[PDB]
Amino acid sequence: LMGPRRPSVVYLHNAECTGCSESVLRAFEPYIDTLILDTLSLDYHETIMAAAGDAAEAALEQAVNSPHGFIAVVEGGIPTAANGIYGKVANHTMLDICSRILPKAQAVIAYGTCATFGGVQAAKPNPTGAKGVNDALKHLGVKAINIAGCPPNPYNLVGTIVYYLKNKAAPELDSLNRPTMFFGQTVHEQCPRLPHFDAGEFAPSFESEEARKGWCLYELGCKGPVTMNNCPKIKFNQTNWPVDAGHPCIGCSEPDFWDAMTPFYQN
């Protein structure tokens, strides 16, 4: 799987929906083929790898124990209730897998709000005791760079990896361990509807003429004022983002957003 040359990435899937992996497939300039053939060596990834079963497990072992070192990218929260049994791969708990692998990585990136902060399965009443990577593994000294969102902008993953490869260090991180170069501004301070907010020009309903005219979505629940992300600037898929589609921000790059930002249609 890897030896010298391209840096090795081990990508792990815990309690996740695979939306974060799908977001990486949307990479643009560079595209995912460039990333996997030229930039990096993707040495374990359950969604796309050829090997299955015992051969997949052997691929993982080969990558993790390589003398060349690896970077870990982690998708999903870690279920910790009941000694980890709510999530297993190859009959090992996700908790055990990550506890064994992540301390061996040269660097760890927690990709998506589930891996960063616990995410959707950690919302009340959290039946599986899901935790974000740094919370679950604090005791082992794991300090993953957190790239939040549900899913994040893949621009933010690639940018973080490129930085790390060039500088051999993490970029500047905020108090939630997120890179300031992507997460330094609120969604709201970047939003094209900000002049309507300032004027108290709010859409009262989605069917309203005010909504049709593009008035501010705050009365309809927009969490842009309390959410750190680069959505209005970079957009998604090179073309759109929630408020430009007429829908409030739901706060998806913030910790505990499922409980903190709900009801989604109120402020």
Partner: peptide
Amino acid sequence: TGQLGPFTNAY
């Protein structure tokens, strides 16, 4: 390159 990536240990 000997770094088969997602083709490592393919059947």
